[PDB]
Structure formats: structure tokens, C-alpha cells
Amino acid sequence: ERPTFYRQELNKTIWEVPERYQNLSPVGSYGSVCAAFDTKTGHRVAVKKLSRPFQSIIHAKRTYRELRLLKHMKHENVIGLLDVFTPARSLEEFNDVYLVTHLMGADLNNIVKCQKLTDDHVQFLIYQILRGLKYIHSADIIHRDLKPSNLAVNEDCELKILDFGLAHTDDEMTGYVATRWYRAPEIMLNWMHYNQTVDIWSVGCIMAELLTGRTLFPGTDHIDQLKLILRLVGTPGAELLKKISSESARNYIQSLAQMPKMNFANVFIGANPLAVDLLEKMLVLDSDKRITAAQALAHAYFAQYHDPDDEPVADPYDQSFESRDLLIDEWKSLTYDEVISFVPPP
Numbered sequence: 001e002r003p004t005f006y007r008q009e010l011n012k013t014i015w016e017v018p019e020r021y022q023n024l025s026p027v028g029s030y031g032s033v034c035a036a037f038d039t040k041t042g043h044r045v046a047v048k049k050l051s052r053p054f055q056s057i058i059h060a061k062r063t064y065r066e067l068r069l070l071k072h073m074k075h076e077n078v079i080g081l082l083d084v085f086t087p088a089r090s091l092e093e094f095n096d097v098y099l100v101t102h103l104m105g106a107d108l109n110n111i112v113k114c115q116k117l118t119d120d121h122v123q124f125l126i127y128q129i130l131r132g133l134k135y136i137h138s139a140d141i142i143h144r145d146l147k148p149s150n151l152a153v154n155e156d157c158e159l160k161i162l163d164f165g166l167a168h169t170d171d172e173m174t175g176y177v178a179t180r181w182y183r184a185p186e187i188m189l190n191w192m193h194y195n196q197t198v199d200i201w202s203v204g205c206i207m208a209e210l211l212t213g214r215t216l217f218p219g220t221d222h223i224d225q226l227k228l229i230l231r232l233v234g235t236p237g238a239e240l241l242k243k244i245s246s247e248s249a250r251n252y253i254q255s256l257a258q259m260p261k262m263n264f265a266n267v268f269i270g271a272n273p274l275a276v277d278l279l280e281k282m283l284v285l286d287s288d289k290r291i292t293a294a295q296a297l298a299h300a301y302f303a304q305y306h307d308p309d310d311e312p313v314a315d316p317y318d319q320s321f322e323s324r325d326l327l328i329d330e331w332k333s334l335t336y337d338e339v340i341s342f343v344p345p346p
Ligand SMILES: Nc1ccc(N2C(=O)C=CC2=O)cc1
Pocket: 211, 212, 213, 214, 267, 268, 269, 270, 271, 272
């Protein structure tokens, strides 16, 4: 049952993998990644070797979280797991974890910065993002890091969501950085407990950028970005203010002069009126009032692609491990069980 493994050193790293994976080629270094040819399936794949997966309790739990999430995702518009393996023959010698996915080429950044996008292209790209998000949200998963570099696109304009947020550093979110430009204001500023509605804010920012060719909220820091956001959508009323938990944050918001919501038709000049309407329903400051993924799929902007019989939901997903307090070797044994129980896709 166990395949034969072979060892090789590539760019100062030892790779020990099943014989089915051939012609390994480093492509980046979380972990290190190689492209390879999978002779069993005929696909070009990415093989990721995790770095120090069990070095702390925090790191061991994150390894388990990533493997559980990738094993669950089975949807045309979401990255899935082709294989997971370890050269260890027993739990006692278990130390390394390797993950195998389809090799991705272009991301949405390349399409946006380069090509000329018709409204038809925007419809199809945003439709596929929302189709994947309906699936993800139906399992009570929040992506939390949706942005153009985390969306893979091929020559036929087909799209996959990848790089789920496995929980970023403060330094990574500081300054003039794309890592913050797509984040909802309530999570950027820790206003309140957040939920899946943060992802719809991100879709609105991405859709705006496809329509204009320009970043919607390219702030030079957290406060500059908040000012750009409030100039477009308006300052909050008393209803949303009650929902912000920090007294200082509430005090700061009330220090700002009040501003009305702008006319989106005079911002997104020449856009399809149905695109403008959908943007007004995503980019809502109060997260309770944003449109959901399931509701957006039925919006008239997507009439040529919407098929309610081909927009599936996910199997239920048990996340109770997230509140569990375990030792390193307990998280490690749980991860080992999930490696050896993996069943490949058809
Ligand atoms: N700045 C800016 C650039 C482009 C746009 N635009 C749309 O939003 C849809 C067509 C179009 O040219 C709007 C503002």
C-alpha cells in the first residue's frame, strides 16, 4: 500500500517524495514549493513541504487547521487537495508534511493590470468568486484574505479561490500595502467581532478594480484608508456606532466631520447600471446590512450565468477543535491521523 519514496536535495532542502512525482523544480519558499509532473494523474502540480510544522503548540495547531480545511474543500471555484503524504512509517518518526495541489499560473493581478476587460468578463469573474463564496460560507468558513493575488485565473477566464486566511502580522498590514487595501473596516480597526460579511466587502473592492483598472481604497496607512472609505460610503450613523465596542474607536469616529454617501454612478463612470447597483449593496459600512453571496448570485447583473441548480453548498464542517487546548504531541497525532486517512479525488 505504501508507495516507494526517493530522496533528493534541491536548493539546500531535502525532498523525499513518492516516485509518481517527477521532474521537481523549485518555485518559491510557511514552507518551500516545487512544481512537478504527477505521473498518476497527468497534472502539473505544486508540492509544498511545510517548514517546522510542529515547532510550537501554535504552529502544530495551525498545521492541523490547514490540513482539515484543504481536505474539506471540494468545489470547482475553490482550491482542493490532490494528495498529502509523509515519508514516516510510524507516528514515532513523523516529522514532515507535504501538500499537493494543482499548479496555478496567472492570478487576477496579471489580468487586471494587463488586459482590457469587457463588462461580460467582469460578470463572469465576479460570478465565479460569489459561487465559491456561497459554498465556503455555507460551511461557516470565513476566507478573510480575499485579494487579486489569491485568485487564480486561466486562459478561459475560469477562476479558483486560494490561500485561505489561517490567521497576518502587524508589520504586514502597515503602510502602503495591498495586504490591507481589500479588508473590511471593522476588521482593519478591530471595531467588533467579525463574521463572513467581511468577505463580501473584499469582493466589492475587487469588482470596483476590475471595472476601473485602479485600486479602490489605496490607503497609505490605516487612518488614510478609513478616510477614503468614509468619503465614498458616508460616515456612520448612531445605529452602527452602537455596535462598535471600543470607546476610543467610537470617540475617534465622532471626531470626524460627517459626510454623505456619494453617487456611485458619478464614481464608476460609464459602468453597467446593474454593476453600480450591486456595488452599492456590497460596499455597505454596517456589515449586518451587506448583501450575502447567496443573495448576490440572484442579482440581475448575473442573469446570463446564474443557475440555481448548479450553485452547490458544502458538507457540514466541524470546527470544534478551535476551542480545544491540546499539547504539541496531541495536535501532531491528530494531524498524522488525517494524513493517513486521506482519500484522493476521482
Ligand atoms: N477612474 C475611473 C476609471 C474607469 C472607470 N470606468 C468604470 O467604472 C466602467 C467603465 C470605466 O471606464 C471609472 C472611473
